[PDB]
From Swiss-Prot:
GO terms for molecular function: ribosomal small subunit binding; rRNA binding. HAMAP family: RbfA. Belongs to the RbfA family. Keywords: Cytoplasm, Ribosome biogenesis, RNA-binding, rRNA-binding. Interacts with the 30S ribosomal subunit as a monomer, binding in a position overlapping the sites of the A and P site tRNAs, and displacing segments of the 16S rRNA. Probably contacts 16S rRNA and ribosomal protein S9 and S13. One of several proteins that assist in the late maturation steps of the functional core of the 30S ribosomal subunit. Associates with free 30S ribosomal subunits (but not with 30S subunits that are part of 70S ribosomes or polysomes). Required for efficient processing of 16S rRNA. Probably interacts with the 5'-terminal helix region of 16S rRNA, bringing together different domains of the 30S ribosomal subunit which aids assembly. This is Ribosome-binding factor A. GO terms for cellular component: cytosol.
Length: 91
C-alpha cells in the first residue's frame, strides 16, 4: 500500500540527500514524506540544522537529480516529483 511505498521513498531520499554535497544540507534530516493520492507528488518534510529556507532551496534545486537517484532504486513507472517542506508542516 501507500504507507509501505512512503517508507521506502523516505529511507531512499534520506540517503540520496546525505549523498549531496551542498553545505546548506549539512545535518539535515528527513522527518517524513507523504505521497499524493495518485502518486504524482511526494511531499518531503525536513529538519534543517540552520537556515531552513536555504536548505529548502538547496533541495528544490536538486529536485531533478534526486528524482533521477530515486528512479535508480525504486520500482515505479513514473517517479513522483518532490515538494520540500519544513518539518513543522508534516501531517
Amino acid at each position: 500500500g501507500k504507507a509501505h511505498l512512503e517508507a521506502q521513498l523516505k529511507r531512499a531520499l534520506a540517503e540520496e540527500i546525505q549523498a549531496l554535497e551542498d553545505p546548506r544540507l549539512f545535518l539535515l534530516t528527513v522527518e517524513a514524506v507523504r505521497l499524493s493520492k495518485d502518486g504524482s507528488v511526494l511531499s518531503v518534510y525536513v529538519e534543517a540544522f540552520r537556515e531552513e529556507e536555504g536548505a529548502l532551496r538547496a533541495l528544490s534545486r536538486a529536485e531533478r537529480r534526486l528524482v533521477a537517484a530515486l528512479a535508480r532504486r525504486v520500482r515505479m513507472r513514473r517517479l513522483p516529483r518532490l515538494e520540500f517542506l519544513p518539518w513543522r508542516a508534516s501531517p
